[PDB]
Design a protein around this motif. Structure first.
Motif, PDB file in Angstrom:
ATOM      1  N   UNK A  14       0.799  -1.214   0.000  1.00 12.97           N
ATOM      2  CA  UNK A  14       0.000   0.000   0.000  1.00 12.97           C
ATOM      3  C   UNK A  14       0.843   1.281   0.000  1.00 12.97           C
ATOM      4  N   UNK A  15       1.939   1.283   0.745  1.00 11.27           N
ATOM      5  CA  UNK A  15       2.807   2.451   0.801  1.00 11.27           C
ATOM      6  C   UNK A  15       3.505   2.644  -0.549  1.00 11.27           C
ATOM      7  N   UNK A  16       3.761   1.549  -1.258  1.00 10.37           N
ATOM      8  CA  UNK A  16       4.410   1.663  -2.553  1.00 10.37           C
ATOM      9  C   UNK A  16       3.405   2.187  -3.563  1.00 10.37           C
TER      10      UNK A  16
ATOM     11  N   UNK B   8      12.898   6.793   8.484  1.00  8.12           N
ATOM     12  CA  UNK B   8      12.959   5.522   9.181  1.00  8.12           C
ATOM     13  C   UNK B   8      11.973   4.519   8.586  1.00  8.12           C
ATOM     14  N   UNK B   9      10.709   4.908   8.476  1.00  7.44           N
ATOM     15  CA  UNK B   9       9.718   4.009   7.915  1.00  7.44           C
ATOM     16  C   UNK B   9      10.239   3.507   6.588  1.00  7.44           C
ATOM     17  N   UNK B  10      10.845   4.420   5.831  1.00  3.89           N
ATOM     18  CA  UNK B  10      11.420   4.104   4.531  1.00  3.89           C
ATOM     19  C   UNK B  10      12.624   3.213   4.662  1.00  3.89           C
ATOM     20  N   UNK B  11      13.446   3.433   5.678  1.00  4.32           N
ATOM     21  CA  UNK B  11      14.594   2.557   5.860  1.00  4.32           C
ATOM     22  C   UNK B  11      14.058   1.217   6.350  1.00  4.32           C
ATOM     23  N   UNK B  13      11.309  -0.157   5.729  1.00  2.96           N
ATOM     24  CA  UNK B  13      10.767  -0.875   4.599  1.00  2.96           C
ATOM     25  C   UNK B  13      11.858  -1.337   3.664  1.00  2.96           C
ATOM     26  N   UNK B  14      12.897  -0.534   3.499  1.00  2.59           N
ATOM     27  CA  UNK B  14      13.959  -0.920   2.598  1.00  2.59           C
ATOM     28  C   UNK B  14      14.585  -2.185   3.145  1.00  2.59           C
ATOM     29  N   UNK B  15      14.794  -2.226   4.456  1.00  5.42           N
ATOM     30  CA  UNK B  15      15.395  -3.388   5.091  1.00  5.42           C
ATOM     31  C   UNK B  15      14.499  -4.621   5.056  1.00  5.42           C
ATOM     32  N   UNK B  16      13.195  -4.429   5.174  1.00  5.17           N
ATOM     33  CA  UNK B  16      12.286  -5.561   5.107  1.00  5.17           C
ATOM     34  C   UNK B  16      12.330  -6.141   3.690  1.00  5.17           C
ATOM     35  N   UNK B  17      12.389  -5.255   2.710  1.00  7.03           N
ATOM     36  CA  UNK B  17      12.450  -5.695   1.349  1.00  7.03           C
ATOM     37  C   UNK B  17      13.761  -6.386   1.106  1.00  7.03           C
ATOM     38  N   UNK B  18      14.837  -5.824   1.636  1.00 10.06           N
ATOM     39  CA  UNK B  18      16.134  -6.460   1.432  1.00 10.06           C
ATOM     40  C   UNK B  18      16.059  -7.882   1.970  1.00 10.06           C
ATOM     41  N   UNK B  19      15.667  -8.012   3.240  1.00 16.38           N
ATOM     42  CA  UNK B  19      15.576  -9.295   3.935  1.00 16.38           C
ATOM     43  C   UNK B  19      14.719 -10.364   3.272  1.00 16.38           C
ATOM     44  N   UNK B  20      13.589  -9.980   2.716  1.00 15.21           N
ATOM     45  CA  UNK B  20      12.767 -10.999   2.100  1.00 15.21           C
ATOM     46  C   UNK B  20      13.423 -11.440   0.813  1.00 15.21           C
ATOM     47  N   UNK B  21      14.205 -10.518   0.255  1.00 17.31           N
ATOM     48  CA  UNK B  21      14.932 -10.718  -0.986  1.00 17.31           C
ATOM     49  C   UNK B  21      16.007 -11.784  -0.833  1.00 17.31           C
ATOM     50  N   UNK B  22      16.681 -11.789   0.308  1.00 12.31           N
ATOM     51  CA  UNK B  22      17.717 -12.780   0.541  1.00 12.31           C
ATOM     52  C   UNK B  22      17.147 -14.122   0.950  1.00 12.31           C
ATOM     53  N   UNK B  23      16.195 -14.090   1.882  1.00 14.38           N
ATOM     54  CA  UNK B  23      15.547 -15.288   2.410  1.00 14.38           C
ATOM     55  C   UNK B  23      14.704 -16.037   1.400  1.00 14.38           C
TER      56      UNK B  23
END
Ligand SMILES: NC[C@H]1O[C@H](O[C@H]2[C@H](O)[C@@H](O[C@H]3O[C@H](CO)[C@@H](O)[C@H](N)[C@H]3O)[C@H](N)C[C@@H]2N)[C@H](O)[C@@H](O)[C@@H]1O
Ligand SMILES: NC[C@H]1O[C@H](O[C@H]2[C@H](O)[C@@H](O[C@H]3O[C@H](CO)[C@@H](O)[C@H](N)[C@H]3O)[C@H](N)C[C@@H]2N)[C@H](O)[C@@H](O)[C@@H]1O
Lengths: 137, 136
Positions: A14-16, B8-11, B13-23
């Protein structure tokens, strides 16, 4: 439980969707693409090299490279070697933060600073751990 | 004040995206799909939708999406409308198993009250987001 994982997924999606729309113009004005916009924002925190941007992103190095020397060509990003940002690249970020914080402000004007503070503490602590796990593999 | 919470919210989220990307690399590699292809399977894990709306959520423009759809149709991962297959259910399950185990082992020392309050604040923010998005 794993309701939180689904919520987060949906919350991030949603944020994206919101960010894409709010940033459509600025992006068009810059010749920029969504993904390039991201790299420019992903690069807003630390200078990175193609591989790092690819790892932290999941997409095939090929695609990540096409959009990377398009930003150099556009003087939106720069070598040193690594990849930092350029004023035109910065001005973009400023214009981006500006559109973001004006709406972010709106829907959060009736929030309690103390409740938000504790919330963040928890998220910062989870962010810390997320990064940590990410270092290994 | 908020400019910070946005970063922060953006970081975060960036980190959550990174993490799912590796896992999930090994797994997408396994089912022979790209990351973009994976994401496409995850929205259809929830509900099924046609192409028209499939790009409207995403943001990646012209026909790029329909190309992922037929790519996924070819592996028997997606059935036509366009929904999800039995072959697709397995992936998501396997996907969820990984996401959950790690997310749990990462939240397990917190106090239920603590997490819930976080959810309730993210829920309300998601409520306003969509509501704002909807007002196209
Ligand atoms: N497709 C996958 C391949 O892409 C690039 O190959 C070339 C791009 O395709 C060109 O860009 C073209 O396509 C873009 C959309 O993708 C258009 O916006 C643009 N107007 C087009 O000129 C770009 N100029 C040079 C680049 N070497 C990458 O280098 C390569 O790693 C990757 O495997
Ligand atoms: N539904 C909520 C979730 O949304 C994504 O889930 C999917 C990712 O998005 C995919 O990402 C890639 O595929 C996308 C397809 O559109 C591309 O746009 C993107 N740039 C690519 O890197 C990834 N490979 C699989 C993952 N299951 C987020 O990652 C995840 O954090 C969030 O919880």
């Amino acid at each position: 439980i794993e309701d939180h994982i689904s919520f987060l997924e949906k919350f991030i999606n949603d944020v994206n969707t919101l960010t894409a729309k709010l940033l459509k113009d600025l992006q068009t004005e810059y010749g920029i693409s969504a993904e390039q916009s991201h790299v420019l924002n992903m690069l807003s925190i630390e200078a990175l090299t193609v591989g790092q941007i690819t790892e932290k992103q999941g997409v095939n190095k090929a695609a990540v490279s096409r959009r990377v020397k398009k930003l150099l060509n556009a003087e939106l990003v720069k070598l040193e070697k690594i990849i930092k940002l350029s004023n035109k690249g910065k001005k973009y970020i400023k214009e981006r933060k500006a559109i973001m914080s004006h709406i972010a402000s709106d829907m959060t004007s009736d929030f309690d600073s103390k409740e938000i503070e504790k919330v963040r503490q928890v998220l910062e602590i989870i962010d810390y751990r997320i990064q940590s796990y990410t270092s290994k593999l």
